PDB file of C-alpha atoms in Angstrom:
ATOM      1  CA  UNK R   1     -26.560 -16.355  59.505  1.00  0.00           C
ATOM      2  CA  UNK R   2     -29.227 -18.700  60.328  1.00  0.00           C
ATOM      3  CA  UNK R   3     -28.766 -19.898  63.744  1.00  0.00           C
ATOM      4  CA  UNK R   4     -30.523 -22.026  66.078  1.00  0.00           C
ATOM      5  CA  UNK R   5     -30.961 -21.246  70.056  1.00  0.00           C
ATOM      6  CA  UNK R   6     -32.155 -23.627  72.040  1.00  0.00           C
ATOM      7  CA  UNK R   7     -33.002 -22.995  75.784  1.00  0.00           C
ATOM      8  CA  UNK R   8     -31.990 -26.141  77.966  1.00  0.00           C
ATOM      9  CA  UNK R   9     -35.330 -28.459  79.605  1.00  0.00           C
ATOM     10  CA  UNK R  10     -36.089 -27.487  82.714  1.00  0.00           C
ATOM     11  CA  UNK R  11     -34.500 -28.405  86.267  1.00  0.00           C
ATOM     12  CA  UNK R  12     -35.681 -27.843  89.776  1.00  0.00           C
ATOM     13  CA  UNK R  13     -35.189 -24.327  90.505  1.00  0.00           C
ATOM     14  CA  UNK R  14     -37.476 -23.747  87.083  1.00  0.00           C
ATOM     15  CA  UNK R  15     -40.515 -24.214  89.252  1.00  0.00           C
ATOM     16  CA  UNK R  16     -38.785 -22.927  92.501  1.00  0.00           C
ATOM     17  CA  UNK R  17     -38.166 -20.374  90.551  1.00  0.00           C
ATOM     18  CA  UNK R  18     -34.567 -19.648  91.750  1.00  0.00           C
ATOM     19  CA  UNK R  19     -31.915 -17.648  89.967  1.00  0.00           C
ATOM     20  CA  UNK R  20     -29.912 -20.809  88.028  1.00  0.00           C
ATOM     21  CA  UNK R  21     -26.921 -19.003  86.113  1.00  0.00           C
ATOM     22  CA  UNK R  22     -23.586 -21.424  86.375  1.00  0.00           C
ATOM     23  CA  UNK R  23     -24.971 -23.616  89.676  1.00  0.00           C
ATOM     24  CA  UNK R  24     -24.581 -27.311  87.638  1.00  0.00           C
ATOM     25  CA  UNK R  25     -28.157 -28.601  88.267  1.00  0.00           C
ATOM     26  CA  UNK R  26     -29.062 -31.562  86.249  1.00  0.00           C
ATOM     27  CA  UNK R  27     -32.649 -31.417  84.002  1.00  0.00           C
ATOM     28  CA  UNK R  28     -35.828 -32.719  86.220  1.00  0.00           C
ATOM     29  CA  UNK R  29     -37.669 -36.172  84.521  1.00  0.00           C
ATOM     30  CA  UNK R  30     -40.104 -33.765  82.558  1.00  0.00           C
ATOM     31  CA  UNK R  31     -36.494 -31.501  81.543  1.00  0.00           C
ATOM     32  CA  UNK R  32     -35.333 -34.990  79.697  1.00  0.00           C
ATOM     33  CA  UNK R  33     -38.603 -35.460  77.863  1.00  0.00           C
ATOM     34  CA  UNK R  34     -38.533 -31.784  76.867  1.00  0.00           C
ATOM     35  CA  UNK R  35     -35.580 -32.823  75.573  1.00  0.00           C
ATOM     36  CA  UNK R  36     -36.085 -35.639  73.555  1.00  0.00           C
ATOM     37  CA  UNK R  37     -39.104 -33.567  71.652  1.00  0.00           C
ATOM     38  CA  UNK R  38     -36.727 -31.752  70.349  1.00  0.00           C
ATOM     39  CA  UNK R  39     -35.280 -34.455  68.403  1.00  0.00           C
ATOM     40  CA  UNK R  40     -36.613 -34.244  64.757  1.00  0.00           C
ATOM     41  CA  UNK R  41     -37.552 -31.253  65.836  1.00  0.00           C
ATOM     42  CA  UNK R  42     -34.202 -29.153  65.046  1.00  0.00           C
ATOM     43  CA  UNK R  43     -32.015 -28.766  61.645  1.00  0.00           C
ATOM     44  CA  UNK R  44     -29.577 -31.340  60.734  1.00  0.00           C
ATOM     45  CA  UNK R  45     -26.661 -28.769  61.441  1.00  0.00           C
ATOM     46  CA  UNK R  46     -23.317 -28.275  63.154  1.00  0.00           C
ATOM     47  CA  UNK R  47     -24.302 -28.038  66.734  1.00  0.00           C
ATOM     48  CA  UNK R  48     -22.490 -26.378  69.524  1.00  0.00           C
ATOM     49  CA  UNK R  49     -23.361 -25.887  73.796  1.00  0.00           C
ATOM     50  CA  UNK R  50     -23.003 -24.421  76.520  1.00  0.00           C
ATOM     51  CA  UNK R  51     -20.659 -26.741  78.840  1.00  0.00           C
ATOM     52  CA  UNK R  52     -22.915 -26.934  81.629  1.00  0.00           C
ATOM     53  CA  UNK R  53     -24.824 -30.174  82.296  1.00  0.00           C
ATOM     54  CA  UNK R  54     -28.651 -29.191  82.147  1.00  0.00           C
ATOM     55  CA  UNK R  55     -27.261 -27.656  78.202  1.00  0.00           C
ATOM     56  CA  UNK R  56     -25.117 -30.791  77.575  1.00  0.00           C
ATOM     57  CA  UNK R  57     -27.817 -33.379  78.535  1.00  0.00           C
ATOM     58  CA  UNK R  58     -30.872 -31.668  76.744  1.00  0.00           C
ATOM     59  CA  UNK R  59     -27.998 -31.357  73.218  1.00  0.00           C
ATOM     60  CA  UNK R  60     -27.554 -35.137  73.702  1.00  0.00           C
ATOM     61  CA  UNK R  61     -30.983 -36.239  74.390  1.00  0.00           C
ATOM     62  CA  UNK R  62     -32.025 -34.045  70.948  1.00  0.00           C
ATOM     63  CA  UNK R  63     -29.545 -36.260  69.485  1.00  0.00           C
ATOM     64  CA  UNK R  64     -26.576 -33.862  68.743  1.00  0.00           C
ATOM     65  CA  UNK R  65     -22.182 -33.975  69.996  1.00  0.00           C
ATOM     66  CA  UNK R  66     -22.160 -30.325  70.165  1.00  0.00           C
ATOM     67  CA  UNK R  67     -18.629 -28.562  70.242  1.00  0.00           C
ATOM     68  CA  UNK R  68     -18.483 -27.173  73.987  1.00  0.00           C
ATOM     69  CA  UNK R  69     -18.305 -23.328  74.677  1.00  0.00           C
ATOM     70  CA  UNK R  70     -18.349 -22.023  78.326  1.00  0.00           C
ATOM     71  CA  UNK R  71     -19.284 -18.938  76.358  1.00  0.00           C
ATOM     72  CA  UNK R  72     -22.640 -20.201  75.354  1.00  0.00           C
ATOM     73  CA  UNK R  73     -23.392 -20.484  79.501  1.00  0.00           C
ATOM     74  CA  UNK R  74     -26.272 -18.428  81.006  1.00  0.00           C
ATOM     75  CA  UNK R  75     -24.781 -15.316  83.043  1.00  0.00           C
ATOM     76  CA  UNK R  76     -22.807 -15.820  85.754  1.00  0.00           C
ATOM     77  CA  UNK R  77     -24.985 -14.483  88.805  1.00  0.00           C
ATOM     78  CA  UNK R  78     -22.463 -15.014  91.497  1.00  0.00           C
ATOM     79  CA  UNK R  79     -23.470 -14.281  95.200  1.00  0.00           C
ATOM     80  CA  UNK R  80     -26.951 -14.240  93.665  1.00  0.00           C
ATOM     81  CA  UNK R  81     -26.456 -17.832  92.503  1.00  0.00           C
ATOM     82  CA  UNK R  82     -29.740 -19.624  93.668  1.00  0.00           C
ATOM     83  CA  UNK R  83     -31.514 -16.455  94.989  1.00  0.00           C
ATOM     84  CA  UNK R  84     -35.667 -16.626  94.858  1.00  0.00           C
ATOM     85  CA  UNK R  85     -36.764 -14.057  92.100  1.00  0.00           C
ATOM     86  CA  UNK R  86     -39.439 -13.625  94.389  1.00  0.00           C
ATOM     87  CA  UNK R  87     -37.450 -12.075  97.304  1.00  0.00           C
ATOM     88  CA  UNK R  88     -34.475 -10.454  95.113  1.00  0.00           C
ATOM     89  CA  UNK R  89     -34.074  -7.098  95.752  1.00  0.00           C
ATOM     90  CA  UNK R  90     -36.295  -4.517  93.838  1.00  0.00           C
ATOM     91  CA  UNK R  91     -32.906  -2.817  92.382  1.00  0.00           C
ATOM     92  CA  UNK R  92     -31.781  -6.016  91.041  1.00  0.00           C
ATOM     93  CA  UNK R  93     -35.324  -7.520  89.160  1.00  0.00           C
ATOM     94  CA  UNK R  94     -35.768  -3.813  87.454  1.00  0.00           C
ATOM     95  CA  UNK R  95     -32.321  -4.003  86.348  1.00  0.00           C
ATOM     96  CA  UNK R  96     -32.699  -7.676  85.081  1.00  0.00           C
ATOM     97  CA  UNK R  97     -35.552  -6.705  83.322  1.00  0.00           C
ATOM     98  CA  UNK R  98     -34.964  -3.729  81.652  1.00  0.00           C
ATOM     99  CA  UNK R  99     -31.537  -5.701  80.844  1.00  0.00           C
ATOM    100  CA  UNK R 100     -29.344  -3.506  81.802  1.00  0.00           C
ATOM    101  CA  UNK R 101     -26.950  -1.892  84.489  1.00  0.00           C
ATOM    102  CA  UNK R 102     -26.728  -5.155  86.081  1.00  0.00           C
ATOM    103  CA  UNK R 103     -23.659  -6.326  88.338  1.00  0.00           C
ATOM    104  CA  UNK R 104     -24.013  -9.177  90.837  1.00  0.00           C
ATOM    105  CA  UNK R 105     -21.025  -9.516  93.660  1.00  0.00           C
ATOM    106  CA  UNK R 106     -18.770 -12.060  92.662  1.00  0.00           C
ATOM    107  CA  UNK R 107     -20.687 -12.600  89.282  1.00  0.00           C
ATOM    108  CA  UNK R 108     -20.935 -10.939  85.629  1.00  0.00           C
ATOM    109  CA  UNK R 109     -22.341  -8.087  84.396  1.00  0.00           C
ATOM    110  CA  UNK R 110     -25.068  -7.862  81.901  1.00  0.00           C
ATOM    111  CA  UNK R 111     -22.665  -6.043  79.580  1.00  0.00           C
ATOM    112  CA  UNK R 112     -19.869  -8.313  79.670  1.00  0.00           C
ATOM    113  CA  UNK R 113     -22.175 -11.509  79.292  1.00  0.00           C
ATOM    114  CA  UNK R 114     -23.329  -9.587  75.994  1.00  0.00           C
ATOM    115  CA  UNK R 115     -20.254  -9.172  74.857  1.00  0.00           C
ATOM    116  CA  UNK R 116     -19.388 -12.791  75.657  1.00  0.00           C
ATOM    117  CA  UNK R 117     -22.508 -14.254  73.546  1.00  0.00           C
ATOM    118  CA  UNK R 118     -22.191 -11.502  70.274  1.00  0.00           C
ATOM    119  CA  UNK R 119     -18.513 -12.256  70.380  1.00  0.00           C
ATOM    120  CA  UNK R 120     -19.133 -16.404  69.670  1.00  0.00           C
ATOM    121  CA  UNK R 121     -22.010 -15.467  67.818  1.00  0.00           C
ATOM    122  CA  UNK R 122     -19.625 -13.406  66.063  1.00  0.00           C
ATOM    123  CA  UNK R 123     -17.663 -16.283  65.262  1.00  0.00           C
ATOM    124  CA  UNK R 124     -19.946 -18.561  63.933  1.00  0.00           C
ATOM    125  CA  UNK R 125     -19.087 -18.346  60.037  1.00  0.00           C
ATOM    126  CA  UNK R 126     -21.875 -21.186  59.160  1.00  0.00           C
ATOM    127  CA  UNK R 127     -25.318 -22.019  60.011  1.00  0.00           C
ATOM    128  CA  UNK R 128     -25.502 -24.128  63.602  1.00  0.00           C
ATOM    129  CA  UNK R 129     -27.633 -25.210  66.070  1.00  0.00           C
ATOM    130  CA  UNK R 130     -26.788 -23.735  69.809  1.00  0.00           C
ATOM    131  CA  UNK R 131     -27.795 -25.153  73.225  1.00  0.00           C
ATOM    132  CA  UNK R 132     -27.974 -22.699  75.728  1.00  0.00           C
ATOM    133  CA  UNK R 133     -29.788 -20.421  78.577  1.00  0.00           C
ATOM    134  CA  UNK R 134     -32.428 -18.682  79.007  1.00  0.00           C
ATOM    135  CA  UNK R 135     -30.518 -15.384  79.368  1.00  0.00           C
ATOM    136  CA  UNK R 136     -28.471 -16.377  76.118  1.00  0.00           C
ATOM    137  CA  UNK R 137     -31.947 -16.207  74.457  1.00  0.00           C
ATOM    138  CA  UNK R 138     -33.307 -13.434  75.857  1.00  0.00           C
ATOM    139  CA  UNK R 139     -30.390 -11.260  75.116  1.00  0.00           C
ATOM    140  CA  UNK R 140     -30.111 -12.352  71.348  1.00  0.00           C
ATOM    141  CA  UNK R 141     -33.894 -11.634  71.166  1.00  0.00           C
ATOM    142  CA  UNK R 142     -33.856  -8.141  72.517  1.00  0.00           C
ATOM    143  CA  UNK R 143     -30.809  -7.275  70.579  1.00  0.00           C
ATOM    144  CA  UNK R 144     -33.031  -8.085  67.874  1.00  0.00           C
ATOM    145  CA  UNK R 145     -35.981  -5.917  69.096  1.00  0.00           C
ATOM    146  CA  UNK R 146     -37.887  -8.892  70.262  1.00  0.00           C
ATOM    147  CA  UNK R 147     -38.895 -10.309  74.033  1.00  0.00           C
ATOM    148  CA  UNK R 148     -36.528 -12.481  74.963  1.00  0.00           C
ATOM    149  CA  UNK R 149     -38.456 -14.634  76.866  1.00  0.00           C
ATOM    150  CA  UNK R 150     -39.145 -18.427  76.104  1.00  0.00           C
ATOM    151  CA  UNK R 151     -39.848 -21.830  77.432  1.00  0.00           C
ATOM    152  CA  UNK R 152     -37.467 -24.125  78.195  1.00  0.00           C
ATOM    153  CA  UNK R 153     -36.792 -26.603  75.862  1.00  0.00           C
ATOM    154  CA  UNK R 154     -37.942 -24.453  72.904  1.00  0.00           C
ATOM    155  CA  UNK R 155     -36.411 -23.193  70.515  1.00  0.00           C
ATOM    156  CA  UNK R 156     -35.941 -19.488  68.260  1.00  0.00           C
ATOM    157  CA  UNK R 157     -34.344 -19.571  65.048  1.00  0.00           C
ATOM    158  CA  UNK R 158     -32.594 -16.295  63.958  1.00  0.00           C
ATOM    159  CA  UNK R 159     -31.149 -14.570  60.969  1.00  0.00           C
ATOM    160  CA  UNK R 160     -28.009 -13.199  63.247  1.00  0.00           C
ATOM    161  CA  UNK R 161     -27.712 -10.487  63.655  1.00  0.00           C
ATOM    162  CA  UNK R 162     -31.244  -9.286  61.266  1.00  0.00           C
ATOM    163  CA  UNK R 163     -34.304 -10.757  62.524  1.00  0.00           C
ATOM    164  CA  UNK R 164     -35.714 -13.684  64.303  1.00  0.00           C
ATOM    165  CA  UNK R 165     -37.312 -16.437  62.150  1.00  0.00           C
ATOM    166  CA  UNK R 166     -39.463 -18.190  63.827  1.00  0.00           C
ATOM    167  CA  UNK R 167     -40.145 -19.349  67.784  1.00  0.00           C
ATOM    168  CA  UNK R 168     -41.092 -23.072  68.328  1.00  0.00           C
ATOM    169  CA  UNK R 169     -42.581 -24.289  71.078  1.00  0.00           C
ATOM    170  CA  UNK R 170     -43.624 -28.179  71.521  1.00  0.00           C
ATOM    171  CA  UNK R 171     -46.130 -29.999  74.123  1.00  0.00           C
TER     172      UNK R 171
END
């Protein structure tokens, strides 16, 4: 099924770099034009998007009215919400990137938020364009052998759940 993630432009804590998982920050000026690129940028298709603002504003500026679906929201990082990468404990980063084994307090675990994104994915019974998270992304990618890492406001098509198609990237 050929499906369409995009990650959401940037906000603030992209260059603090800050842990942003459901904290409701709004895209930065340069997020918005990130945005807007996108627009003739992405297939003509049924869109859908993660409920939080940063996802909502970057679907609208790329001219879509997705369907919202908390379940296409980055991972919930609880008491971890708005932690520096930097300083995060050595137990947590080698968990979050291996992907794997990976519980904040008061938040999700890596294996549930998987289960949350395959299981939409899942549902998806036509091809669709998806605003989302970087962490959404990253864990379709690595579930399809790939490194799940890209900019935000790009985009990664996919053949779910075969292959990735193609990565796009704008400036």
């Amino acid at each position: 099924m050929e499906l369409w993630l995009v990650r959401h432009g940037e906000t603030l804590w992209n260059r603090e770099g800050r842990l942003l998982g459901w904290t409701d920050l709004p895209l930065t000026a340069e997020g918005e034009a990130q945005a807007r690129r996108l627009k003739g940028a992405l297939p003509s298709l049924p869109a859908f998007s993660s409920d939080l603002l940063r996802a909502r504003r970057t679907a609208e500026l790329a001219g879509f009215s997705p369907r919202l679906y908390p379940e296409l929201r980055e991972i919930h990082f609880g008491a971890l919400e708005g932690a520096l990468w930097e300083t995060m404990d050595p137990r947590y980063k080698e968990a979050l990137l291996r992907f794997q084994g990976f519980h904040p307090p008061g938040g999700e675990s890596l294996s549930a938020f998987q289960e949350r994104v395959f299981r939409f994915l899942e549902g998806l019974k036509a091809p669709a364009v998806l605003f989302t998270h970087g962490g959404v992304v990253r864990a379709v990618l690595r579930a399809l052998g790939e490194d799940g890492l890209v900019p935000p406001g790009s985009a990664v098509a996919v053949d779910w759940p075969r292959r990735v198609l193609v990565r796009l990237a704008l400036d």
